[PDB]
Amino acid sequence: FHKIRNEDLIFNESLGQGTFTKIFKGVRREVGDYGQLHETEVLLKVLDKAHRNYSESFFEAASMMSKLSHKHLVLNYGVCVCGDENILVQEFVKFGSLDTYLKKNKNCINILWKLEVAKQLAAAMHFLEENTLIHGNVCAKNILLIREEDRKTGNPPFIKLSDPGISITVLPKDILQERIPWVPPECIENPKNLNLATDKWSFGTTLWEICSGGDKPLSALDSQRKLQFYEDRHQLPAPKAAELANLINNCMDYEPDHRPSFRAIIRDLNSL
Numbered sequence: 256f257h258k259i260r261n262e263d264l265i266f267n268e269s270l271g272q273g274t275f276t277k278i279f280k281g282v283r284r285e286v287g288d289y290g291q292l293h294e295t296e297v298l299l300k301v302l303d304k305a306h307r308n309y310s311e312s313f314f315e316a317a318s319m320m321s322k323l324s325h326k327h328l329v330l331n332y333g334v335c336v337c338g339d340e341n342i343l344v345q346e347f348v349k350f351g352s353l354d355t356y357l358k359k360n361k362n363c364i365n366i367l368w369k370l371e372v373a374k375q376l377a378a379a380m381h382f383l384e385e386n387t388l389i390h391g392n393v394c395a396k397n398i399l400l401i402r403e404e405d406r407k408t409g410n411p412p413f414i415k416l417s418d419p420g421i422s423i424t425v426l427p428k429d430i431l432q433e434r435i436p437w438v439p440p441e442c443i444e445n446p447k448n449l450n451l452a453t454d455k456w457s458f459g460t461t462l463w464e465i466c467s468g469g470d471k472p473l474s475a476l477d478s479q480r481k482l483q484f485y486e487d488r489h490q491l492p493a494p495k496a497a498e499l500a501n502l503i504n505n506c507m508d509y510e511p512d513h514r515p516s517f518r519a520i521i522r523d524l525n526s527l
């Protein structure tokens with residue numbers, strides 16, 4: 256990763272929290288192309304000081320994805336490790352995370368919008384699968400909306416997939432349980448079962464989010480009941496707008512070897 260000076264970063268408003276992280280809008284002063292000076296809007300992800308021992312995982316997450324370049328993967332500018340903080344410096348996406356966008360705009364989001372966003376997320380995951388790179392935390396909060404749909408110009412929305420954060424292979428067990436049903440059943444059994452097939456299951460959970468206007472699946476269940484949901488081999492309920500429900504259930508297959516490839520997933524989506 257490129258090293259960025261603390262002196263060149265300005266922290267502005269808080270944009271919320273992630274797992275053991277705090278998120279801020281900021282500005283980076285930099286010399287750009289042709290030697291021209293720029294002040295660039297950035298997203299700053301800050302690892303909690305009391306959790307500095309997760310920094311290896313925090314940064315290995317961002318590093319692995321940033322060794323590949325793709326139009327549907329978020330751009331990382333570098334890191335700032337000046338002094339006591341661990342900071343990931345990332346492109347600032349105008350419209351933020353998909354989960355809060357769906358909640359605030361669920362009135363004005365139709366099947367064609369959901370299908371376009373689903374196709375774009377599948378394209379990103381197909382790219383990862385072809386490169387045998389595991390993401391490990393596919394979810395609507397980790398989808399960023401670069402551009403809104405503009406029917407007046409026939410422009411579709413455009414999304415990017417963010418970095419996965421601290422791996423489920425090092426997180427506390429109670430956090431993994433709270434992440435049911437994004438974390439697949441085999442990873443609750445053994446977090447070291449993390450595999451390419453992990454991302455197929457979470458992709459299904461994420462489609463459910465996209466179809467449910469920002470609702471969180473199984474949010475009414477506490478962690479003990481989320482565990483028993485998997486023990487009883489239940490599936491999620493079909494969303495009210497059910498056009499994608501069969502694809503959701505096909506992806507959320509309790510047998511990891513039976514989950515469809517992303518090529519097959521893209522073929523399905525192209526049939527609707």
Ligand SMILES: Nc1nc(Nc2ccc(S(N)(=O)=O)cc2)nn1C(=O)Nc1ccccc1
Nearest residue numbers: 270273278298346347348349350351396397
């Ligand atoms: N790269 C990036 N850009 C933005 N932009 C943004 C814009 C507007 C809003 S708001 N509150 O006005 O709706 C919030 C955020 N967010 N972001 C990001 O990575 N978020 C994130 C993802 C996963 C976990 C934690 C944080």
